[PDB]
């Protein structure tokens, strides 16, 4: 997260870190047994770390649970990063408490201009903001018109742009798979973008409200 602010510790209780001996992607807990992330973050086996704030300091609030199954959306495409979403089933249910909680899945898409929050342990491009501590950023959903202006022929109906066209604030590498929550509902998954925080290069996110049908069916 570039140009954001350190999240209040555990305020994004749904935020999890996908680990394989190190942090490589973010994710969102949606139930005691399931985590939603980006399909391009796929790995057959993943160690899901919940209740984290500083990923390199044992805080006593963490839960480390290995995946039992990792499932990419059936229509995911590694060519255009279409339908970039996947589910991770935990080998054992996570315990919900003050530091670990699931975020609601959407049943209603959000309108353009809606203010949301994106978070992650990704690059900050700064020494002032330590990416090892969960970073937060308030950002508005951008119109498809602006998205298509910025990324000609790359934006599908399962994607949406969010951020600042003037640049300076944006999600970044390492934030991938992470959450974009709007009014307490998970509306996006950090997917891709051209560089980070660059003018006219807003972040592109998987549109969960269009992909939630698949998520719900797979969880049941
Ligand atoms: Ca920690
Ligand atoms: Na798969």
| Domain match, 56 and 94 both | yes
Catalytic residue among 10, 17, 73, 84: 84
| Domain match, 109 and 29 both | no
| Domain match, 204 and 108 both | yes
Active site residue 176: yes
Question: What is the distance in A from the centroid of ligand 1 to the CA of 50?
Answer: 9
Q: Considering every ligand atom shown, identify the ligand nearest to the alpha carbon of residue 86 and give its number.
A: 2
| Domain match, 122 and 202 both | yes
- Residue 194, domain extent: 1-12+103-209
Active site residue 127: no
Question: What is the distance in A from the centroid of ligand 1 to the CA of 160?
Answer: 31
Largest Cα–Cα separation, the chain = 46
| Domain match, 44 and 128 both | no
Q: Measured between alpha carbons, how far is 173 from 161 in angstroms, rounded to an integer?
A: 16
Question: What is the distance in A from the centroid of ligand 2 to the CA of 90?
Answer: 16
| Domain match, 37 and 113 both | no
Catalytic residue among 119, 176, 191, 212: 176
| Domain match, 21 and 88 both | yes
Written in H, E and C, the secondary structure of 79-132 is CCCECCCEEEEECCCCCCCCCCCCCECCCCCCCCCCEEEEEECCCCCCCCCCCC
| Domain match, 7 and 109 both | yes
Active site residue 54: no
| Domain match, 108 and 118 both | yes
125: burial class by Cβ within 10 Å (0-12, 13-18, 19+)? Answer: middle
Q: Considering every ligand atom shown, identify the ligand nearest to the alpha carbon of residue 218 and give its number.
A: 2
Question: What is the distance in A from the centroid of ligand 2 to the CA of 75?
Answer: 10
| Domain match, 121 and 62 both | no
Question: At 155, which CATH number?
Answer: 2.40.10.10
Total domains, the chain: 2
Catalytic residue among 40, 53, 73, 201: 40
Q: Considering every ligand atom shown, identify the ligand nearest to the alpha carbon of residue 63 and give its number.
A: 1
| Domain match, 118 and 202 both | yes
Question: What is the distance in A from the centroid of ligand 1 to the CA of 56?
Answer: 5
């Amino acid at each position: 997260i570039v140009g954001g602010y350190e999240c209040t510790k555990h305020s994004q209780a749904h935020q999890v870190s996908l680990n394989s001996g190190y942090h490589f992607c973010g994710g969102s807990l949606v139930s005691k047994d399931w985590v939603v992330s980006a399909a391009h973050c796929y790995k057959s086996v993943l160690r899901v770390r919940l209740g984290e704030h500083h990923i390199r300091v044992n805080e006593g609030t963490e839960q480390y649970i290995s995946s039992s199954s990792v499932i990419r959306h059936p229509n995911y495409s590694s060519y255009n990063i279409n339908n970039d979403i996947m589910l991770i089933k935990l080998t054992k249910p996570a315990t919900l408490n003050q530091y670990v909680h699931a975020v609601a899945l959407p049943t209603e898409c959000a309108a353009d201009a809606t203010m949301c929050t994106v978070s992650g342990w990704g690059n900050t491009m700064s020494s002032v903001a330590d990416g090892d501590k969960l970073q937060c950023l308030s950002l508005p959903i951008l119109s498809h018109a602006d998205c298509a202006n910025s990324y000609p022929g790359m934006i599908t109906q399962s994607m949406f742009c969010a951020g600042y066209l003037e640049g300076g604030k944006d999600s970044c590498q390492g934030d991938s798979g992470g959450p974009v929550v709007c009014n307490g509902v998970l509306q996006g998954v950090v997917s891709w973008g051209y560089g980070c925080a660059e003018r006219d290069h807003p972040g592109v996110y998987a549109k969960v409200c269009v992909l939630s049908g698949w998520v719900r069916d797979t969880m049941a």
